[PDB]
């Protein structure tokens, strides 16, 4: 589930197999790559369900976002983070899952 590339000004990205549960032991990568000057916003939509833990932030499965030297996350749980204004035109999204659990995953739209 790596090398997913999005080059249109707007689009939709999901965890593998969404809206069904994502696969175990996944290390997925997604790239949004736009021309210079564009500034991408990421906004989650629909159900957001990434395995979490009640005491510790995201120790099992997580989504992380990187743009240049900027890093957001990790994120997990039953509620998506607030929309992310990346202020950037080229973004990498990483999604890791461990070897157990049944959770639905995530869906986001991006725009610039």
């Amino acid at each position: 589930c790596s090398g997913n590339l999005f080059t249109q000004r707007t689009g939709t990205i999901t965890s593998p197999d969404y809206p069904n549960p994502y696969p175990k032991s996944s290390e997925c990568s997604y790239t949004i790559d736009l021309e210079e000057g564009f500034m991408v916003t990421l906004q989650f939509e629909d159900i957001f369900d990434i395995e979490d833990h009640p005491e510790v932030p995201c120790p099992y499965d997580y989504i992380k976002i990187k743009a240049g030297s900027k890093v957001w996350g990790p994120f997990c749980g039953e509620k998506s983070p607030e929309p992310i204004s990346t202020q950037s035109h080229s973004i990498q999204i990483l999604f890791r899952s461990d070897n157990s659990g049944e959770n639905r995953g995530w869906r986001l739209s991006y725009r610039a």
């Binding site: 833990h53 009640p54 005491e55 510790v56 120790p59 099992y60 157990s100």
Partner: peptide
């Protein structure tokens, strides 16, 4: 009727104890 389906997995384990202190620094 027959017994039901097995129950769901239990809740996750607790956070482990902290690790040991690091090695000493320059003297």
């Amino acid at each position: 009727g027959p017994p039901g389906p097995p129950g769901p997995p239990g809740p996750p384990g607790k956070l482990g104890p902290p690790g040991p202190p690091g090695p000493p620094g320059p003297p």
